[PDB]
A paper describes a structure:
The rate-limiting enzyme of ethylene biosynthesis is 1-aminocyclopropane-1-carboxylate (ACC) synthase (ACS), which is generally believed to be a single-activity enzyme evolving from aspartate aminotransferases. All ACS proteins contain a conserved aspartate aminotransferase (AAT)–like domain and belong to the α superfamily of pyridoxal-5′-phosphate (PLP)–dependent enzymes.
The asymmetric unit contains one AtACS7-R6 dimer, and each AtACS7-R6 monomer forms a complex with the PPG molecule. Compared with the wild-type AtACS7 dimer, the structure of the AtACS7-R6 mutant overall does not change much (with an RMSD of only 0.59 Å), except that the region replaced by PpACL1 BOX2 and adjacent region (residues 91 to 104) become disordered.
Numbering used by the authors:
A (entry chain A): 15 to 74, 105 to 444
B (entry chain B): 12 to 73, 105 to 443
The structure:
């Protein structure tokens, strides 16, 4: 019999986590308004369909379009030379691709907790790079401290792991929260001192609720004119989340480093975007009058939905983190828990899954330093399916 | 200052292959590309193996795994069954080949690959994966086909130098040779793989472009009859739409693997290189349609064949003998005894005269790792009727002087 590679038989792909085991129970009997109203409702998949009718109602080289549409998201606060854009088949493809370019097998990336539980696959699986978690907690809304960067750096060098860059998510999945200007430039400054790359995964940037509150790492870069420090940062964007077009698989790497783009271009061979979809999204994304209209209404709609989910959970006795972005909220069932530990979280999540019939991302899958938090998505469902889901959790709390 | 950021070994590695002749030709092509009206004296591209001879049929025409399975069945002529549940879509074949290599081999382990091969394997297989290639050596003494003795030879090479070997990756039909592999050598190679306990990977990307349906033998043909699960799970097939359909920008390649354990790892690993669902949706009905895919593949086979005929007949009455080919989008022509120095440097110097003086891009055999000096791949399917007769008349009147 034939063996396969270490990588092949490695269980770093992550299909044993809670995250997936939820998706499996969802399919066992998915919710349906007419035909299965007691069925399980999906709130663990961070997808955006609240603004889809606008694209749908629309449709009755391409780098330039992608550059505009990025400019429009950031509000002329960035310039984006279409010649540095490198198309890759989704962000998951961009993040991995960068990691090959930015780190050796066994070297590391610092990643603030909580993070996208899917990084455990993307960054690690084929690349051989490790993650060292930068530890963050609810004492400051889970934001990156200059001391917790140093702490997590020392962790790596304590164990002979070279560190090669830090990969934040801006705005943060799962926190649903922008990072403040002041912490970005603080982090960039950390990167020149340690001589590493800053990777910004700006995938939720059209889904930040108020345009003024979002600070892209592009904002902190084309003003500071040292080529040495410019070439550390790189931006990873995709259409998957803002446009809600995740199956079209268009992500990009915009990198402020001449040497990356041309390696990233050659490396894109392995993960190209279908030219047919490039062609057919070109005019739309290029069209200022539309992208302006779209992003304004998307911001609002996502915001207005966030409001109803936290108000719902408020008058049922659940306080969420003060969020201003993303397609989800980061709700606290800390002091609403049995055992106050990791096993207690996984046991509570199994009651939510089996009894509420409700899929929710548990904080332990996100590597949260703190026990008892949960990501609940809201943008992959109707108005009505949310009020059902809220009424399900409202009347679960009644039984206390 | 002096506080500059390094990149990875892989990043600064020159295994991406943009120093070869292959690319340096593409760069001189752009300097002034050929154009019938605008500028004919311009350089003609015969180094890019692309198919546009049968495109007007798709143009005049216009889950999804089921379509891809049918279309593959139609290419092989019901000689394969293809469970759509084993198909794993990847963004092109270059993405499939790499993806498999991660699944089939560790960093520093090897793959045996018969020479000559797609010079782009030097990137695909090696670059991110850390695997090496050991060439299986083939020569014109038997039309560059794989011998059981040259497999053993190239295996020993690896084990001589402590390189574990993990599978062999043939191209069927062969790029650049333009030539099918015979049934007898495939099953001979499959037998080699059970004895050494390795995988056989078949890159069947040119399979709709083999000229006569009866002459092509897929590794799928040699497998669903032999019913040992042990030996079945060694082979894997890599196909794409890029070359037969001539739809290379839509980036749809697939891995069909006869190994339960691969498909589910290959599926999870496809995350990194997915096919746009929009193109999947819009190619679905077409590829599913038997009446059309039958008609298409018959005419494509013929058209590619009829073009091959004119290119070798052209080169014949100008004194160039090509290899007897029956497939692909190219021919493997011999300028061995039509050369100055008879060595690698002599080939690269001859190719620079063809590029600068003929104004003609042609893949030199040295880029393809050919064991033998002086051969060249010349593509023909990425150009009109007329641009070929110009290119032929250019080489005809070079031989005159
Ligand atoms: C920060 C971040 N980066 C990248 C991606 C990948 O998206 P791409 O452009 O490659 O489609 C996601 C999607 N994360 C959500 C997952 C979506 O579906 C994939 C399922 N694992 C989630 O639930 O957090 C994300 O949240
Ligand atoms: C054996 C083999 N494998 C893989 C590929 C990659 O094709 P994909 O399915 O990824 O589109 C090619 C095409 N090789 C040609 C390259 C074509 O370039 C495409 C330009 N976009 C060549 O010149 O040899 C090939 O001959």
């Amino acid at each position: 019999n034939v063996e396969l590679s270490r990588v092949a038989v490695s269980d770093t792909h992550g299909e044993d986590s809670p995250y997936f085991a939820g998706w499996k129970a969802y399919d066992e009997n998915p919710y349906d308004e007419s035909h299965n109203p007691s069925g399980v409702i999906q709130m663990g998949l961070a997808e955006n369909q609240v603004s889809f009718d606008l694209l749908e109602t629309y449709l009755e080289t391409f780098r330039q379009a992608m550059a505009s549409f990025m400019e429009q998201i950031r509000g002329g606060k960035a310039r984006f030379d279409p010649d540095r854009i490198v198309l890759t088949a989704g962000a998951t493809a961009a993040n991995e691709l960068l990691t090959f370019i930015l780190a050796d097998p066994n070297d590391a990336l610092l990643v603030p907790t909580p993070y996208y539980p899917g990084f455990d696959r993307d960054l690690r699986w084929r690349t051989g790079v490790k993650i060292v978690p930068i530890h963050c907690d609810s004492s400051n809304h889970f934001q990156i401290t200059p001391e917790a960067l140093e702490s997590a750096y020392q962790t790596a060098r304590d164990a002979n792991i070279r560190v090669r860059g830090v990969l934040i998510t801006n705005p943060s999945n799962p926190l649903g929260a922008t990072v403040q200007k002041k912490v970005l430039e603080d982090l960039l400054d950390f990167c020149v001192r340690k001589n590493i790359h800053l990777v910004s995964d700006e995938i939720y940037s059209g889904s930040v609720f108020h345009a003024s509150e979002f600070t892209s790492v592009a904002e902190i870069v084309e003003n500071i004119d040292d080529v040495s420090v410019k070439e550390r940062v790189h931006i990873v964007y995709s259409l998957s989340k803002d446009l809600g077009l995740p199956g079209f698989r268009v992500g990009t790497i915009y990198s402020y480093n001449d040497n990356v783009v041309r390696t990233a271009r050659r490396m894109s061979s392995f993960t190209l975007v279908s030219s047919q979809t490039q062609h057919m999204l070109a005019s739309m994304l290029s069209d200022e009058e539309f992208t302006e209209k779209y992003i304004r209404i998307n911001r609002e709609r996502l915001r207005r939905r966030y409001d109803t989910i936290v108000e719902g959970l408020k008058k049922a006795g659940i306080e969420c983190l003060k969020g201003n972005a993303g397609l989800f909220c980061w709700m606290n069932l800390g002091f609403l828990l049995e055992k106050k530990t990791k096993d207690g979280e996984l046991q509570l999540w199994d009651v939510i899954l089996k009894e509420l019939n409700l899929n929710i991302s548990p904080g332990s899958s996100c590597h949260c330093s703190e026990v008892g938090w949960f990501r609940v998505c809201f943008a992959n469902m109707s108005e009505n399916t949310l009020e059902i889901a809220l009424k399900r959790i409202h009347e679960f709390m009644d039984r206390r």
